[PDB]
């Protein structure tokens, strides 16, 4: 009785951070020891549960949230963080019990001239609640004058493209992130 | 260096048919692939970019799909101005590589080639060179095999072929094969023949002549 | 201090490029926008283009689509304006303007403005001015100084080291066909004081480090 | 109209140089990167080089790396390809093309294909001397609809133009593409199919025109 | 593009009067995307009114705004001395965000004739091989003034340049400086140098001359 970890980490295409995808995993034995021992994963950090002592633990359900950001933003996928991703795209609660795994995906998600497939929310009037998912494309009204669906001064599109390039700095290269939560 | 392979290499379709062309990449290239249409004597024309984004002006009967290593170009109802060679190009990294192309050919009835052989002219023999030409006129399909035999001796490496584009009137092809010998070698033999095997011919057709007569 | 500070004066040869900086302060740069406007000496305001700070998206005018590219750097809270292939027609003063915004909302107009950046484009070289006296003719008389042949702008002129201000007219400089500037500064004084009051104009030209104190004489 | 016109091609010996130009009009020149694509006779297109909007980035195929140099003059709306130390495998028709700029969320993304292509300019790298063709008759057979034609043999460079009876005879004419021989000269055949009855009561003259050598040869094709 | 035209070119008004400036668009524009700016010599533009009728922060309440569509108005109820400068209107709704050509609000005054002075080239400059003769028009109103150089009764043209100061903050007059430029060779070929000044305050053109040497 194994798990779909194979098709979640080694998936062909990931989702944008603003439209983060969630896979549900309930009752299947897994070996998180081959992942902690892997140099492929640039980030393996767990909260509320030790990353070493992980295989013994048992919880009723496991959620696998996956998305793509850039390297400088991987520090925001943690409880009590602030920034573009944490405030407007993906917020982890303070009492989050799980792990955050990330690896550099430059060879897959970067294109010469810039990739147009991965977006991130740039404007929002209020911060996201923990595990909230916002995919609305409403024109952000930054001023008092109401936008009527048309962009302009103080009327901007809420989503922006990363424009991933292979020549970008490693801080700006694409990173695929997988967030495991245990309830 | 990203390679691209297309299948099939040729397609014989008719007006209204649903034609699908595939493009396979040696590595995953996400949604960064384009499709081009090219007619003889003209620059390539962009039809689709980003897998499934129809270029402005291209009729909606053209469509595209795919992701990663496999991509598809579909023509719902083929129109007469769609018979051309189609190429797929990836844009993940430089160098931008193209596919080998797939030629969309007009389907028609099998027609056997009319075979004619021509001895070298007397004026050319005065130049010290002899050229024997074998003409395959108005046939279908394009596939054809020509063998030169000099006194029943099969030749190899001393002939060149040339095929016309598909005819705009009868959708047939024409082939011209030239055997080139020196005047010394040409006058050492008597019988010159080109044996033509073709799909419309139940058996190889041979046109010959005897040097002089 | 909701501020918007720009680069210093620029003097470039024709065919080169200039990049004017514009740094924000007081408000949160990340959510505002910055437009660029130029003004030639004595002309109207010419809108060049604007940029959204958060996204970097740009809109340019037709007349600047070819040689201007507007950028920004949210780390250094600064926006830039690159002007390629300079020519004499580009000699003007360039302003940056932005609405001040907090973390979520913006002002409904361009209320914050920069001090302005003067860009001079010509083949001329730095040169100090020659100051010649405008002597009074032999109840009120007029005298002054001729600040001739300098580059680039500007010069500053005072009379009696700042003591004489009443009746002083320092005219704006004209650009001669030689590429150098000429400026005249005159003062009207009573005719009686000509023999018992020394008048000295103080000409200072910072680009050439020239400090000339010339005394005007009634011949 | 959005238009790209290239020029500057021609015949050149191996190891020597050539400079291609590309004249653009109908679009803001400095908002688009530009590609050079070449296509050998009978083969598919091969991307050669690209240059960014401002000229700061340049990429080349390994085949031309170190020999070719791409450049652009945004003030003149002109693209250039400087070809040095030319080889035989450089012979192709050279197009200049405009980059496909994908816009998502008002952001531009470059290097996504080529949407506007030029007519192409031909370069030919060969050590062969310019030579007009010999025109030899392919006489119709005695009893073997009959076929006759002309053999346009040993000429350089491309192309020749072949008409029959000064263009009056067009029905049933097949002018084949030329083959490149091992000698470096081109050979070509142009044939026509006619009723056997007309062989003794209709002359057939093929007209071969070769501008590079300033030769026009007309050959009378008659039965033996 | 949307063309913005302003009127009047120069608004000559007395301090304490009500000023009215106009801004015209070539097509209907949003009222919430029009602004009014004030600019003083050597300074950056300063936002006065935005949204057609929304006073900016710190702008006095004597500044007002009205209009809709293609016609807009900037009204100053009581004109203060610190308000005499140049005013621009800009629409920032439809790109490009075009500006108007500007309106100069000057202090109206009574006609004052200029005090005219002529200056021969200094002996120090003559040593350099170039001669500069200067004609000063001091404190006059209105700004319009005409200077003609006459060298031995020969009217000069194409060898002179003018410069006008901003309106004085105390007497509301302007000053003009015109420079005639000749070489030392041509300067010594003539004897009488004079500049003729034509102005509204002069009942007839006034001529100020000097004799080369004396
Ligand atoms: C961020 O600012 C908005 C709007 O502020 C307006 O614009 C500023 C430039 C300044 O001129 C303010 O005086 C303006 O009010 C704030 O949103 C306003 O909040 C008040 C609170 O009661 C409300 O009455 C208004 O209707 C709101 N207006 C808008 C346009 O939202 C907002 O609260 C500020 N946020 C922070 C964190 O300070
Ligand atoms: C991913 O693929 C590698 C081989 O490339 C394999 O070793 C690894 O176990 C895989 N892991 C998952 C989670 O699919």
PDB file of N, CA and C in Angstrom, chain D residues 2-77:
ATOM      1  N   UNK D   2       3.051  45.831 -42.322  1.00  0.00           N
ATOM      2  CA  UNK D   2       4.163  45.181 -41.636  1.00  0.00           C
ATOM      3  C   UNK D   2       4.952  44.374 -42.657  1.00  0.00           C
ATOM      4  N   UNK D   3       6.238  44.689 -42.795  1.00  0.00           N
ATOM      5  CA  UNK D   3       7.015  44.201 -43.923  1.00  0.00           C
ATOM      6  C   UNK D   3       8.486  44.104 -43.546  1.00  0.00           C
ATOM      7  N   UNK D   4       9.124  43.017 -43.977  1.00  0.00           N
ATOM      8  CA  UNK D   4      10.561  42.826 -43.844  1.00  0.00           C
ATOM      9  C   UNK D   4      11.135  42.533 -45.221  1.00  0.00           C
ATOM     10  N   UNK D   5      12.146  43.300 -45.618  1.00  0.00           N
ATOM     11  CA  UNK D   5      12.797  43.138 -46.913  1.00  0.00           C
ATOM     12  C   UNK D   5      14.292  42.989 -46.674  1.00  0.00           C
ATOM     13  N   UNK D   6      14.834  41.824 -47.009  1.00  0.00           N
ATOM     14  CA  UNK D   6      16.260  41.571 -46.880  1.00  0.00           C
ATOM     15  C   UNK D   6      16.954  41.699 -48.230  1.00  0.00           C
ATOM     16  N   UNK D   7      18.265  41.918 -48.174  1.00  0.00           N
ATOM     17  CA  UNK D   7      19.070  42.103 -49.372  1.00  0.00           C
ATOM     18  C   UNK D   7      20.531  41.874 -49.013  1.00  0.00           C
ATOM     19  N   UNK D   8      21.374  41.857 -50.040  1.00  0.00           N
ATOM     20  CA  UNK D   8      22.803  41.714 -49.861  1.00  0.00           C
ATOM     21  C   UNK D   8      23.368  40.338 -50.130  1.00  0.00           C
ATOM     22  N   UNK D   9      22.563  39.407 -50.639  1.00  0.00           N
ATOM     23  CA  UNK D   9      23.059  38.086 -50.953  1.00  0.00           C
ATOM     24  C   UNK D   9      23.741  38.027 -52.307  1.00  0.00           C
ATOM     25  N   UNK D  10      24.374  36.893 -52.569  1.00  0.00           N
ATOM     26  CA  UNK D  10      25.050  36.690 -53.833  1.00  0.00           C
ATOM     27  C   UNK D  10      26.029  35.536 -53.743  1.00  0.00           C
ATOM     28  N   UNK D  11      26.851  35.428 -54.783  1.00  0.00           N
ATOM     29  CA  UNK D  11      27.855  34.376 -54.890  1.00  0.00           C
ATOM     30  C   UNK D  11      29.142  34.850 -54.233  1.00  0.00           C
ATOM     31  N   UNK D  12      29.796  33.948 -53.506  1.00  0.00           N
ATOM     32  CA  UNK D  12      31.024  34.271 -52.788  1.00  0.00           C
ATOM     33  C   UNK D  12      31.863  33.005 -52.674  1.00  0.00           C
ATOM     34  N   UNK D  13      33.179  33.163 -52.805  1.00  0.00           N
ATOM     35  CA  UNK D  13      34.091  32.042 -52.665  1.00  0.00           C
ATOM     36  C   UNK D  13      34.141  31.580 -51.210  1.00  0.00           C
ATOM     37  N   UNK D  14      34.595  30.350 -50.965  1.00  0.00           N
ATOM     38  CA  UNK D  14      34.762  29.897 -49.580  1.00  0.00           C
ATOM     39  C   UNK D  14      35.793  30.737 -48.842  1.00  0.00           C
ATOM     40  N   UNK D  15      35.570  30.898 -47.537  1.00  0.00           N
ATOM     41  CA  UNK D  15      36.459  31.662 -46.690  1.00  0.00           C
ATOM     42  C   UNK D  15      36.271  33.162 -46.729  1.00  0.00           C
ATOM     43  N   UNK D  16      35.575  33.694 -47.731  1.00  0.00           N
ATOM     44  CA  UNK D  16      35.353  35.127 -47.827  1.00  0.00           C
ATOM     45  C   UNK D  16      34.045  35.502 -47.131  1.00  0.00           C
ATOM     46  N   UNK D  17      33.684  36.782 -47.201  1.00  0.00           N
ATOM     47  CA  UNK D  17      32.644  37.333 -46.346  1.00  0.00           C
ATOM     48  C   UNK D  17      31.492  37.913 -47.158  1.00  0.00           C
ATOM     49  N   UNK D  18      30.376  38.123 -46.461  1.00  0.00           N
ATOM     50  CA  UNK D  18      29.174  38.731 -47.011  1.00  0.00           C
ATOM     51  C   UNK D  18      28.402  39.376 -45.871  1.00  0.00           C
ATOM     52  N   UNK D  19      27.697  40.462 -46.180  1.00  0.00           N
ATOM     53  CA  UNK D  19      26.887  41.171 -45.195  1.00  0.00           C
ATOM     54  C   UNK D  19      25.459  41.268 -45.708  1.00  0.00           C
ATOM     55  N   UNK D  20      24.519  40.716 -44.946  1.00  0.00           N
ATOM     56  CA  UNK D  20      23.103  40.784 -45.273  1.00  0.00           C
ATOM     57  C   UNK D  20      22.440  41.909 -44.490  1.00  0.00           C
ATOM     58  N   UNK D  21      21.467  42.561 -45.118  1.00  0.00           N
ATOM     59  CA  UNK D  21      20.694  43.621 -44.495  1.00  0.00           C
ATOM     60  C   UNK D  21      19.222  43.237 -44.485  1.00  0.00           C
ATOM     61  N   UNK D  22      18.471  43.863 -43.581  1.00  0.00           N
ATOM     62  CA  UNK D  22      17.037  43.620 -43.459  1.00  0.00           C
ATOM     63  C   UNK D  22      16.349  44.947 -43.185  1.00  0.00           C
ATOM     64  N   UNK D  23      15.477  45.369 -44.097  1.00  0.00           N
ATOM     65  CA  UNK D  23      14.773  46.639 -43.980  1.00  0.00           C
ATOM     66  C   UNK D  23      13.365  46.381 -43.457  1.00  0.00           C
ATOM     67  N   UNK D  24      13.036  46.991 -42.322  1.00  0.00           N
ATOM     68  CA  UNK D  24      11.749  46.808 -41.671  1.00  0.00           C
ATOM     69  C   UNK D  24      10.899  48.065 -41.797  1.00  0.00           C
ATOM     70  N   UNK D  25       9.584  47.866 -41.835  1.00  0.00           N
ATOM     71  CA  UNK D  25       8.634  48.969 -41.858  1.00  0.00           C
ATOM     72  C   UNK D  25       7.268  48.444 -41.443  1.00  0.00           C
ATOM     73  N   UNK D  26       6.451  49.336 -40.887  1.00  0.00           N
ATOM     74  CA  UNK D  26       5.110  48.992 -40.466  1.00  0.00           C
ATOM     75  C   UNK D  26       4.959  48.619 -39.007  1.00  0.00           C
ATOM     76  N   UNK D  27       6.033  48.665 -38.222  1.00  0.00           N
ATOM     77  CA  UNK D  27       5.949  48.344 -36.805  1.00  0.00           C
ATOM     78  C   UNK D  27       7.078  49.043 -36.064  1.00  0.00           C
ATOM     79  N   UNK D  28       6.869  49.248 -34.763  1.00  0.00           N
ATOM     80  CA  UNK D  28       7.898  49.836 -33.914  1.00  0.00           C
ATOM     81  C   UNK D  28       9.093  48.894 -33.847  1.00  0.00           C
ATOM     82  N   UNK D  29      10.207  49.307 -34.454  1.00  0.00           N
ATOM     83  CA  UNK D  29      11.328  48.399 -34.676  1.00  0.00           C
ATOM     84  C   UNK D  29      11.966  47.947 -33.367  1.00  0.00           C
ATOM     85  N   UNK D  30      12.159  48.868 -32.425  1.00  0.00           N
ATOM     86  CA  UNK D  30      12.927  48.582 -31.218  1.00  0.00           C
ATOM     87  C   UNK D  30      12.129  47.849 -30.146  1.00  0.00           C
ATOM     88  N   UNK D  31      10.875  47.495 -30.409  1.00  0.00           N
ATOM     89  CA  UNK D  31      10.084  46.712 -29.470  1.00  0.00           C
ATOM     90  C   UNK D  31      10.125  45.218 -29.758  1.00  0.00           C
ATOM     91  N   UNK D  32      10.911  44.784 -30.744  1.00  0.00           N
ATOM     92  CA  UNK D  32      10.902  43.399 -31.186  1.00  0.00           C
ATOM     93  C   UNK D  32      12.327  42.885 -31.349  1.00  0.00           C
ATOM     94  N   UNK D  33      12.672  41.758 -30.735  1.00  0.00           N
ATOM     95  CA  UNK D  33      13.877  41.036 -31.152  1.00  0.00           C
ATOM     96  C   UNK D  33      13.701  40.497 -32.562  1.00  0.00           C
ATOM     97  N   UNK D  34      14.823  40.153 -33.188  1.00  0.00           N
ATOM     98  CA  UNK D  34      14.800  39.759 -34.589  1.00  0.00           C
ATOM     99  C   UNK D  34      15.668  38.532 -34.811  1.00  0.00           C
ATOM    100  N   UNK D  35      15.195  37.649 -35.684  1.00  0.00           N
ATOM    101  CA  UNK D  35      15.848  36.384 -35.973  1.00  0.00           C
ATOM    102  C   UNK D  35      16.395  36.380 -37.393  1.00  0.00           C
ATOM    103  N   UNK D  36      17.420  35.560 -37.606  1.00  0.00           N
ATOM    104  CA  UNK D  36      17.891  35.195 -38.936  1.00  0.00           C
ATOM    105  C   UNK D  36      17.675  33.699 -39.102  1.00  0.00           C
ATOM    106  N   UNK D  37      16.897  33.318 -40.110  1.00  0.00           N
ATOM    107  CA  UNK D  37      16.643  31.917 -40.418  1.00  0.00           C
ATOM    108  C   UNK D  37      17.045  31.663 -41.863  1.00  0.00           C
ATOM    109  N   UNK D  38      17.710  30.536 -42.100  1.00  0.00           N
ATOM    110  CA  UNK D  38      18.127  30.144 -43.436  1.00  0.00           C
ATOM    111  C   UNK D  38      17.510  28.798 -43.791  1.00  0.00           C
ATOM    112  N   UNK D  39      17.447  28.522 -45.092  1.00  0.00           N
ATOM    113  CA  UNK D  39      16.825  27.293 -45.581  1.00  0.00           C
ATOM    114  C   UNK D  39      17.580  26.829 -46.818  1.00  0.00           C
ATOM    115  N   UNK D  40      18.314  25.727 -46.683  1.00  0.00           N
ATOM    116  CA  UNK D  40      19.031  25.152 -47.806  1.00  0.00           C
ATOM    117  C   UNK D  40      18.046  24.596 -48.832  1.00  0.00           C
ATOM    118  N   UNK D  41      18.464  24.484 -50.093  1.00  0.00           N
ATOM    119  CA  UNK D  41      17.573  23.913 -51.112  1.00  0.00           C
ATOM    120  C   UNK D  41      17.169  22.488 -50.762  1.00  0.00           C
ATOM    121  N   UNK D  42      15.858  22.249 -50.731  1.00  0.00           N
ATOM    122  CA  UNK D  42      15.318  20.939 -50.442  1.00  0.00           C
ATOM    123  C   UNK D  42      15.205  20.588 -48.975  1.00  0.00           C
ATOM    124  N   UNK D  43      15.746  21.405 -48.080  1.00  0.00           N
ATOM    125  CA  UNK D  43      15.717  21.139 -46.651  1.00  0.00           C
ATOM    126  C   UNK D  43      14.784  22.120 -45.952  1.00  0.00           C
ATOM    127  N   UNK D  44      14.514  21.837 -44.682  1.00  0.00           N
ATOM    128  CA  UNK D  44      13.663  22.685 -43.881  1.00  0.00           C
ATOM    129  C   UNK D  44      14.421  23.854 -43.297  1.00  0.00           C
ATOM    130  N   UNK D  45      13.678  24.770 -42.681  1.00  0.00           N
ATOM    131  CA  UNK D  45      14.308  25.971 -42.124  1.00  0.00           C
ATOM    132  C   UNK D  45      15.226  25.640 -40.959  1.00  0.00           C
ATOM    133  N   UNK D  46      16.297  26.423 -40.840  1.00  0.00           N
ATOM    134  CA  UNK D  46      17.243  26.301 -39.738  1.00  0.00           C
ATOM    135  C   UNK D  46      17.466  27.677 -39.131  1.00  0.00           C
ATOM    136  N   UNK D  47      17.095  27.830 -37.863  1.00  0.00           N
ATOM    137  CA  UNK D  47      17.338  29.079 -37.156  1.00  0.00           C
ATOM    138  C   UNK D  47      18.835  29.319 -37.012  1.00  0.00           C
ATOM    139  N   UNK D  48      19.259  30.553 -37.277  1.00  0.00           N
ATOM    140  CA  UNK D  48      20.676  30.916 -37.303  1.00  0.00           C
ATOM    141  C   UNK D  48      21.054  31.777 -36.100  1.00  0.00           C
ATOM    142  N   UNK D  49      20.378  32.909 -35.918  1.00  0.00           N
ATOM    143  CA  UNK D  49      20.764  33.843 -34.871  1.00  0.00           C
ATOM    144  C   UNK D  49      19.582  34.729 -34.513  1.00  0.00           C
ATOM    145  N   UNK D  50      19.648  35.296 -33.310  1.00  0.00           N
ATOM    146  CA  UNK D  50      18.651  36.238 -32.819  1.00  0.00           C
ATOM    147  C   UNK D  50      19.376  37.355 -32.082  1.00  0.00           C
ATOM    148  N   UNK D  51      18.764  38.536 -32.070  1.00  0.00           N
ATOM    149  CA  UNK D  51      19.279  39.684 -31.336  1.00  0.00           C
ATOM    150  C   UNK D  51      18.124  40.316 -30.572  1.00  0.00           C
ATOM    151  N   UNK D  52      18.404  40.780 -29.355  1.00  0.00           N
ATOM    152  CA  UNK D  52      17.374  41.376 -28.516  1.00  0.00           C
ATOM    153  C   UNK D  52      16.952  42.737 -29.074  1.00  0.00           C
ATOM    154  N   UNK D  53      16.053  43.405 -28.345  1.00  0.00           N
ATOM    155  CA  UNK D  53      15.502  44.668 -28.827  1.00  0.00           C
ATOM    156  C   UNK D  53      16.567  45.755 -28.897  1.00  0.00           C
ATOM    157  N   UNK D  54      17.403  45.865 -27.865  1.00  0.00           N
ATOM    158  CA  UNK D  54      18.425  46.901 -27.806  1.00  0.00           C
ATOM    159  C   UNK D  54      19.768  46.453 -28.366  1.00  0.00           C
ATOM    160  N   UNK D  55      19.916  45.177 -28.706  1.00  0.00           N
ATOM    161  CA  UNK D  55      21.182  44.659 -29.173  1.00  0.00           C
ATOM    162  C   UNK D  55      22.098  44.135 -28.091  1.00  0.00           C
ATOM    163  N   UNK D  56      21.627  44.057 -26.843  1.00  0.00           N
ATOM    164  CA  UNK D  56      22.474  43.610 -25.752  1.00  0.00           C
ATOM    165  C   UNK D  56      22.679  42.114 -25.681  1.00  0.00           C
ATOM    166  N   UNK D  57      21.744  41.332 -26.219  1.00  0.00           N
ATOM    167  CA  UNK D  57      21.826  39.880 -26.203  1.00  0.00           C
ATOM    168  C   UNK D  57      21.848  39.346 -27.628  1.00  0.00           C
ATOM    169  N   UNK D  58      22.745  38.394 -27.879  1.00  0.00           N
ATOM    170  CA  UNK D  58      22.884  37.757 -29.180  1.00  0.00           C
ATOM    171  C   UNK D  58      23.117  36.269 -28.975  1.00  0.00           C
ATOM    172  N   UNK D  59      22.421  35.454 -29.762  1.00  0.00           N
ATOM    173  CA  UNK D  59      22.548  34.008 -29.696  1.00  0.00           C
ATOM    174  C   UNK D  59      22.727  33.462 -31.104  1.00  0.00           C
ATOM    175  N   UNK D  60      23.517  32.397 -31.221  1.00  0.00           N
ATOM    176  CA  UNK D  60      23.859  31.835 -32.519  1.00  0.00           C
ATOM    177  C   UNK D  60      23.779  30.318 -32.470  1.00  0.00           C
ATOM    178  N   UNK D  61      23.508  29.720 -33.632  1.00  0.00           N
ATOM    179  CA  UNK D  61      23.659  28.279 -33.779  1.00  0.00           C
ATOM    180  C   UNK D  61      25.146  27.935 -33.807  1.00  0.00           C
ATOM    181  N   UNK D  62      25.487  26.762 -33.266  1.00  0.00           N
ATOM    182  CA  UNK D  62      26.889  26.358 -33.179  1.00  0.00           C
ATOM    183  C   UNK D  62      27.564  26.324 -34.544  1.00  0.00           C
ATOM    184  N   UNK D  63      26.802  26.053 -35.607  1.00  0.00           N
ATOM    185  CA  UNK D  63      27.387  25.971 -36.943  1.00  0.00           C
ATOM    186  C   UNK D  63      28.016  27.290 -37.371  1.00  0.00           C
ATOM    187  N   UNK D  64      27.481  28.415 -36.898  1.00  0.00           N
ATOM    188  CA  UNK D  64      27.954  29.736 -37.295  1.00  0.00           C
ATOM    189  C   UNK D  64      28.650  30.473 -36.164  1.00  0.00           C
ATOM    190  N   UNK D  65      28.786  29.857 -34.990  1.00  0.00           N
ATOM    191  CA  UNK D  65      29.375  30.539 -33.845  1.00  0.00           C
ATOM    192  C   UNK D  65      30.815  30.943 -34.140  1.00  0.00           C
ATOM    193  N   UNK D  66      31.117  32.226 -33.937  1.00  0.00           N
ATOM    194  CA  UNK D  66      32.432  32.765 -34.189  1.00  0.00           C
ATOM    195  C   UNK D  66      32.660  33.270 -35.597  1.00  0.00           C
ATOM    196  N   UNK D  67      31.814  32.883 -36.549  1.00  0.00           N
ATOM    197  CA  UNK D  67      31.919  33.351 -37.926  1.00  0.00           C
ATOM    198  C   UNK D  67      30.870  34.396 -38.279  1.00  0.00           C
ATOM    199  N   UNK D  68      29.653  34.253 -37.764  1.00  0.00           N
ATOM    200  CA  UNK D  68      28.573  35.190 -38.034  1.00  0.00           C
ATOM    201  C   UNK D  68      28.446  36.187 -36.888  1.00  0.00           C
ATOM    202  N   UNK D  69      27.948  37.378 -37.213  1.00  0.00           N
ATOM    203  CA  UNK D  69      27.691  38.410 -36.215  1.00  0.00           C
ATOM    204  C   UNK D  69      26.408  39.139 -36.579  1.00  0.00           C
ATOM    205  N   UNK D  70      25.425  39.076 -35.696  1.00  0.00           N
ATOM    206  CA  UNK D  70      24.157  39.770 -35.881  1.00  0.00           C
ATOM    207  C   UNK D  70      24.236  41.131 -35.201  1.00  0.00           C
ATOM    208  N   UNK D  71      23.579  42.121 -35.799  1.00  0.00           N
ATOM    209  CA  UNK D  71      23.570  43.475 -35.261  1.00  0.00           C
ATOM    210  C   UNK D  71      22.360  44.205 -35.824  1.00  0.00           C
ATOM    211  N   UNK D  72      22.034  45.339 -35.206  1.00  0.00           N
ATOM    212  CA  UNK D  72      20.857  46.097 -35.603  1.00  0.00           C
ATOM    213  C   UNK D  72      21.098  47.583 -35.379  1.00  0.00           C
ATOM    214  N   UNK D  73      20.463  48.393 -36.222  1.00  0.00           N
ATOM    215  CA  UNK D  73      20.503  49.851 -36.137  1.00  0.00           C
ATOM    216  C   UNK D  73      19.068  50.319 -35.918  1.00  0.00           C
ATOM    217  N   UNK D  74      18.709  50.584 -34.659  1.00  0.00           N
ATOM    218  CA  UNK D  74      17.337  50.980 -34.353  1.00  0.00           C
ATOM    219  C   UNK D  74      16.985  52.332 -34.960  1.00  0.00           C
ATOM    220  N   UNK D  75      17.981  53.189 -35.194  1.00  0.00           N
ATOM    221  CA  UNK D  75      17.715  54.474 -35.828  1.00  0.00           C
ATOM    222  C   UNK D  75      17.382  54.333 -37.307  1.00  0.00           C
ATOM    223  N   UNK D  76      17.824  53.252 -37.949  1.00  0.00           N
ATOM    224  CA  UNK D  76      17.592  53.034 -39.369  1.00  0.00           C
ATOM    225  C   UNK D  76      16.587  51.925 -39.650  1.00  0.00           C
ATOM    226  N   UNK D  77      16.039  51.287 -38.614  1.00  0.00           N
ATOM    227  CA  UNK D  77      15.095  50.178 -38.768  1.00  0.00           C
ATOM    228  C   UNK D  77      15.682  49.077 -39.649  1.00  0.00           C
TER     229      UNK D  77
END
